[PDB]
Amino acid sequence: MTNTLTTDQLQELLQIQKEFDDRIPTLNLGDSKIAYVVEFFEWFNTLETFKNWKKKPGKPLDVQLDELADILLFGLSIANQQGFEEYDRDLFFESFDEEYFLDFPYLRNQDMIYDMMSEFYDDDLTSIRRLVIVFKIAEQLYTIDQLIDAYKKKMKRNHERQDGT
Amino acid sequence: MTNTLTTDQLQELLQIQKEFDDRIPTLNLGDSKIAYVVEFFEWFNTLETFKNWKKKPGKPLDVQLDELADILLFGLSIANQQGFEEYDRDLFFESFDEEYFLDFPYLRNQDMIYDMMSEFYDDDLTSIRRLVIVFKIAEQLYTIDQLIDAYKKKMKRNHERQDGT
Ligand SMILES: [Ca+2]
Ligand SMILES: [Ca+2]
Ligand SMILES: [Ca+2]
Ligand SMILES: [Ca+2]
Ligand SMILES: [Cl-]
Ligand SMILES: [Cl-]
Ligand SMILES: [Mg+2]
Ligand SMILES: [Mg+2]
């Protein structure tokens, strides 16, 4: 568990997503952006920081990671659809390294979801920012390693589905 | 007729396209990319460098410019849909300034269309490259000024249509 993300790791993830999306003819960037937000809320719903009525709020770790991996899926798809070049990659690592406001205590505050919504309805939300958000969550609440593992598992199953196996 | 393109001119064009596309709910990046290529061939068909059987090949200048403006329309739309940032703009002006192979005699060769097709079926064709192509054609065969004029005229009519006037 390095809990770090390398250039080669990111490039591999983008390549994995690309191979799967190439098999989706109706691929629609506007729809992918909406799916990103919907999947984000589903992940947020597994964290359960607003569910005061629960004895043990928070779903099992493997469930939370699986729902987080959905956010990553659409984040990678959106990046690929917009053309993720070497200079986009550099800006991503700079933005990721120097993000100051997405740390553990902030992400554990249930009011964080209002800030996220303020980003989500802005036309100018970048594909880079969407990726920074999902990797900071992994880095801060989980590990980047488990997120990558859950996503790769999911995509293997996804290829089996589209293969009819 | 400066036959040049400034940063402010490009930003204005992108803003014009953005306002119009915001009124198109079914906006689909994959469809816009195909439309770019189809409109490209329509413009090429007005140049008529392959129509050996004509006495006066080439349609009137205003027709050629109008069809070129269609290429620009989809080129701007694709750029906007992919998120055209300040660094994309800088790379565009560098690519445009230092393009060596899209000059007048090349563009007047009817075999140029095979090279274009080799670019058009490549998944990795960038929105920047699509814009470099259309502005070099304007610069070399027409002027950038007439292209901008034809596009602005077209978009004014387009807003009148979507306004129901
Ligand atoms: Ca989900
Ligand atoms: Ca891009
Ligand atoms: Ca046309
Ligand atoms: Ca972009
Ligand atoms: Cl309740
Ligand atoms: Cl004939
Ligand atoms: Mg650094
Ligand atoms: Mg220069």
Residue numbers in the entry:
A (entry chain D), B (entry chain D): 1 to 165
Q: Can you provide the manuscript's text about this entry?
A:
SaPIs are clinically relevant pathogenicity islands, residing passively in the host chromosome under control of the SaPI master repressor, Stl. Some Staphylococcus aureus phages encode dimeric instead of trimeric Duts, which are completely unrelated at both sequence and structural levels. The crystal structure of the ϕDI Dut described here represents the first structural characterization of this group of dimeric Duts, revealing particular features. Remarkably for unrelated proteins, our results indicate the de-repression mechanism used by dimeric and trimeric Duts is conceptually identical, involving dUTP as a second messenger turning off Stl-Dut interaction.
Based on the crystallographic data, we decided to mutate Ala73 to the hydrophobic residue Leu. As we previously indicated, Ala73 is placed at the bottom of the nucleotide binding pocket occupying the position responsible for deoxyribose discrimination, thus its substitution for a bulky hydrophobic residue (Leu) should abolish nucleotide access. In vitro characterization confirmed that the ϕDI A73L mutant (ϕDIA73L) presented a null dUTP-binding capacity when it was checked by ITC and, consequently, was inactive as dUTPase. The three-dimensional structure of ϕDIA73L proves that the protein is well folded, showing a dimeric arrangement generated by crystallographic symmetry. Superimposition with wild-type ϕDI structures, both apo and dUPNPP forms, confirms an identical folding (RMSD < 0.5 Å) and rules out any conformational impact of the A73L mutation. A close up view of the active center shows that the new Leu is accommodated without steric difficulties in the nucleotide pocket, with low impact on the surrounding catalytic residues. However, the C-terminal helix α8 presents a higher stabilization compared not only with the apo form but also with the nucleotide complex, allowing us to model all the residues except the last four. In this way, the A73L mutation seems to mimic the nucleotide stabilizing of motif V in the trimeric Duts. However, the structural characterization of the ϕDI Dut A73L mutant has shown that this mutation promotes a compact conformation that could be stabilizing the dimer, supporting our proposition.
